[PDB]
Amino acid sequence: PIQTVGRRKEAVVRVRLVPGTGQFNLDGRTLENYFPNKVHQQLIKAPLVTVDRVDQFDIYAHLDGGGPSGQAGALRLAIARALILVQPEDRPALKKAGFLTRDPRAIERKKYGLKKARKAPQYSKR
Amino acid sequence: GQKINPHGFRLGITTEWKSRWYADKQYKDYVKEDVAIRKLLATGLERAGIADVEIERTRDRVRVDIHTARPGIVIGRRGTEADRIRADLEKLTGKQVQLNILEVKNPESQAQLVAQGVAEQLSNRVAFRRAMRKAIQSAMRQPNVKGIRVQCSGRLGGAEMSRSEFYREGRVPLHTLRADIDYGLYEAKTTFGRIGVKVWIYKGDIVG
Amino acid sequence: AKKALVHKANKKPKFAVRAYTRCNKCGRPHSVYRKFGLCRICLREMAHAGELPGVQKSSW
Amino acid sequence: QRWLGGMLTNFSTVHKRLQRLKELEAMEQTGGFEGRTKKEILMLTREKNKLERSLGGIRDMQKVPSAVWVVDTNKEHIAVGEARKLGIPVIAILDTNCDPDVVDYPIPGNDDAIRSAALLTKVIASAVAEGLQAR
Amino acid sequence: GQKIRIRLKAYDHEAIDASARKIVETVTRTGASVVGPVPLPTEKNVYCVIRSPHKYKDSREHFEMRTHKRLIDILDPTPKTVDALMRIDLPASVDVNIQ
Amino acid sequence: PRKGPAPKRPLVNDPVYGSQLVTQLVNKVLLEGKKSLAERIVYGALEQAREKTGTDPVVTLKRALDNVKPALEVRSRRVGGATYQVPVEVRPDRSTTLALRWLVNFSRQRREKTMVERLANEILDASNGLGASVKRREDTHKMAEANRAFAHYRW
RNA sequence: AGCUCGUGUCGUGAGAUGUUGGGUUAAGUCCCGCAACGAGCGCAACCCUUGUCUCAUGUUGCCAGCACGUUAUGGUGGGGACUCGUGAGAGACUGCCGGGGUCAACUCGGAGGAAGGUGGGGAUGACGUCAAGUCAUCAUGCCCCUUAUGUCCAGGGCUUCACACAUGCUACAAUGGCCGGUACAAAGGGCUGCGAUGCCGUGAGGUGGAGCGAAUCCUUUCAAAGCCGGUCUCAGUUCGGAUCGGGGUCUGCAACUCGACCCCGUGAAGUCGGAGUCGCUAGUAAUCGCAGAUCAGCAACGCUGCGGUGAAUACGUUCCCG
């Protein structure tokens, strides 16, 4: 058994792999039925295309937290780490494109006495 | 308002809570009774130095511990004013009270006791000079402590003007959380109003 | 608060809506949290005094 | 490396620094390097390096000084002044810019040349070696 | 035949852990089966207060209250465990109830 | 920015065309924080250009921006309460930035009542050289060359 | 980012030196040289949170793999293979290399790595200054009423209006307006409280009640922006919502002055706003919804938080301010 976990700014995904055909399951939907974005499509294709072994794995994803782009990035990173695990020889490839660099960017706290984060109220000289 | 309370700053690492119990539905009644008993205990005894008062309130079990420098006027041989305390706590419906009275081994090493003593010394006739210098010297005689600062504010000396004076010896690192810093505030009454005395005592460091 | 106002607050109102907060320690009718029953000033002062079971400085 | 100002006349602080060096070298030999903060050990070693390249002979003085040999007194005004104030005899080289009235045991010569300085150092160390041999 | 959960709550981590350890030791001494003190979400109440009376609203201070809760599940209801349950001494800041 | 220049931001390669000009344009036209709608607007404009000119979008946009890329700018420097206009040459990066900013800012003025055809029409006009971006470019060069005298401050 | 002390040295002396100069740094942070050598309070660190992993760890949480479920779903048994809930620990330390360096701090580039140079943000605000604010949080000395300025009570005011200032929200629309479908967040709160199904309403809502003192139940499997399909085609607009009319719902003993919300109708100003001015340098502004405190109901567009989507330039100190 293989199971991998991905996280992206409050979105958490868990991916299971099968060596089956070139199709994906996202909580019961395919890659086009769910995440109907061409940009997200290329984003998720980027690991497999970089490793140049597309259409060789069937993934099953369980998703929580975040929105479209956050979960898309989380799935991308999770499947990238899963592929690195099953085939370590591709480790010096994704790092060349920086797909192993997890993104440590989140929502900055809204600070009291202000409007939001770094925004400030209007200042009047009189 | 620049320096925050060091005691309240250190409630998460160094200093613990002086009133520990648990409640979910009856928080209002508990806190009302707690402030009532605290005020009654503070008012009933004033000639002695009450350094600390801790309250315990669990289920049917309620008890309180009072720390004083001179327990002789606090626990009688027969318990007369102790019985007065018992009557007062029973009037306000404090149920069973296991009121144990404790003492302090180094009364000169407590911020509250030093503050109180320098307060009456400044109030009666003595200038802030001699009283607070003597308090600092008495604290620095004891070797366990390492630093002290004493501040006084108000109409010092009876003058008609605000005044504030601070004297410091040793190290008083407020900005260190793991610093065993004891803080005490007191007010000395007078015909000119009130004089505030604030004592910081830094006594070594503690590491778990 | 005037002692008469405090006693009238202690006196239970003759109508349901005629009741208000009347902070316990002092008697400041504004900004009285239902969790404590205290005014915000008194709550802050007592919490910084280390005499409340659970309260502490917030930071995150 | 450099003559510290007033380290001779002030003997308490040099003793404190010598104790600090002794204890720090003892801990370094013992091997305490990862039982503290990593950054703490980093500037600990930095303090080691800073207080070692100017501390080469003071580490092994112990029994106070009695004679001071001075090269380029015009660059060593403070050292000679401290020795004079403390009563320590001063044996110094005289240059044309130096005051002969200051040195108790003046030795004319050139202090701007390595060869003359090397020769003078060698002869004076031969003198002190003979003194120890005949001691 | 019957299993009992006990909810076990406190602000303080030290006292709650000590109570759990004592109860587990007592159960082991008595001879009954328990799953163990499984962790539960920690409730947090957050409040805001104004530092200064009479104006200067921008300066405030936040307060928290944290309650750590756990469950202890006991199987095989040994009668001696029930006999020795309520006599166990517990810390002041720790509250345990049965379910 | 007082101490030194901040490091330049990287540009993510455009997945559909491979050149970053299109993603720069879509990032600039982006407003209210929506990448998808701006992307579809730019892509619709580019495909209208495809069907109207019959040539490759990359090269036509390239020489269009080259023909609308400014070369010099005018800067204000004040002394004694009175200002002076000095001409300074521009790095190509800010030149392309200003050209694209002009295009996007003035693409809200064409009176055909839809943004995607607005972009397609102005892109085609700049490709033909009759667009208003050419007019702003000529005005900027007129300002730069006419006031070439006041440059002795050397900035 | 500054404020002091011990010893030493200088001056008859108050005093000075250290704390000056060059460089560097977020910094009195550090280096070099200098009669200074060192040490305290400040700074940094010990604290909270976010980003990775290891171990302990399975309920109310999850469901890989197995049986019962067939649509109502981990729902019912079971399980740690995965998040997760919560405890402990590892790890960012100029660690290594190369060029500039005074073989110095330091600066840039590279390697590994989740992060490269205080990773991101909170908490903490020194000595001092404004006779700054608060006798209306509380107490506090002096003066005042003391048969009253005390004091209970009914109605009315703090929302009055020809004006001016400040802070906000909604619009001047086609990057849009209206109609149906479609899928993913977080946090929080709940006892005379959250309150689901059915019953009848256009919608607030009237009937009554199952789950929960609460990882169990309710906030719809929790929203909007997003995407798809239909239409509107530039007008005071299928924009905009003000004022005004008729009829109601909820709470409250009591809704006119003076609560909120609902149905229907005419549909005012409003065309990107002069002199001038404001917030902002990475998950920031901008946009969108949700939650909480106070609250019976709310004037809330306010305040404190959460999450979604998310780019621009920074040449350089010449000028304006601290």
Curated annotation (Swiss-Prot), chain A:
Keywords linked to the UniProt accession: Ribonucleoprotein, Ribosomal protein
The keyword Ribosomal protein is assigned to this record: yes
Disulfide bonds listed in the record: none
GO cellular component annotations of the record: cytoplasm; small ribosomal subunit
GO function term, MF aspect, one: structural constituent of ribosome
Biological-process GO terms, alphabetical: translation
Domain of life: Bacteria
The family this protein is said to belong to: Belongs to the universal ribosomal protein uS9 family.
Protein's UniProt name: Small ribosomal subunit protein uS9
Organism: Mycolicibacterium smegmatis (strain ATCC 700084 / mc(2)155)
Curated annotation (Swiss-Prot), chain D:
Family: Belongs to the universal ribosomal protein uS2 family.
Designated name of the protein: Small ribosomal subunit protein uS2
Organism: Mycolicibacterium smegmatis (strain ATCC 700084 / mc(2)155)
Coverage span on the entire protein: 94 to 228 of 277
Swiss-Prot record, chain E:
GO MF annotations in UniProt: structural constituent of ribosome; tRNA binding
Keyword Mitochondrion: no
InterPro entries, per the entry: Ribosomal_uS10 (IPR001848), Ribosomal_uS10_CS (IPR018268), Ribosomal_uS10_dom (IPR027486), Ribosomal_uS10_dom_sf (IPR036838)
Pfam families, sorted: Ribosomal_S10
One of the record's GO cellular component terms: ribosome
Gene Ontology terms describing biological process: translation
This protein's UniProt keywords: Ribonucleoprotein, Ribosomal protein
Family: Belongs to the universal ribosomal protein uS10 family.
Xref: PANTHER family: 30S RIBOSOMAL PROTEIN S10 FAMILY MEMBER
Record text on subunit structure and interactions: Part of the 30S ribosomal subunit.
Reported function: Involved in the binding of tRNA to the ribosomes.
Protein's UniProt name: Small ribosomal subunit protein uS10
Organism whose genome encodes this protein: Mycolicibacterium smegmatis (strain ATCC 700084 / mc(2)155)
UniProtKB/Swiss-Prot annotation, chain F:
GO terms for cellular component: small ribosomal subunit
Transmembrane parts of this sequence: none
CDD domains linked to this entry: uS7_Bacteria
Pfam families, per the entry: Ribosomal_S7
Keywords attached to this entry: Ribonucleoprotein, Ribosomal protein, RNA-binding, rRNA-binding, tRNA-binding
Highest taxon in the source lineage: Bacteria
GO BP annotation list: translation
Molecular function GO labels: rRNA binding; structural constituent of ribosome; tRNA binding
Record keyword Ribosomal protein present: yes
Keyword Aminoacyl-tRNA synthetase (UniProt): no
Function recorded in the entry: One of the primary rRNA binding proteins, it binds directly to 16S rRNA where it nucleates assembly of the head domain of the 30S subunit. Is located at the subunit interface close to the decoding center, probably blocks exit of the E-site tRNA.
Subunit structure: Part of the 30S ribosomal subunit. Contacts proteins S9 and S11.
NCBIfam families found in the cross-reference section: rpsG_bact
HAMAP family: Ribosomal_uS7_B
Family in the record: Belongs to the universal ribosomal protein uS7 family.
Protein name: Small ribosomal subunit protein uS7
Organism: Mycolicibacterium smegmatis (strain ATCC 700084 / mc(2)155) (Mycobacterium smegmatis)
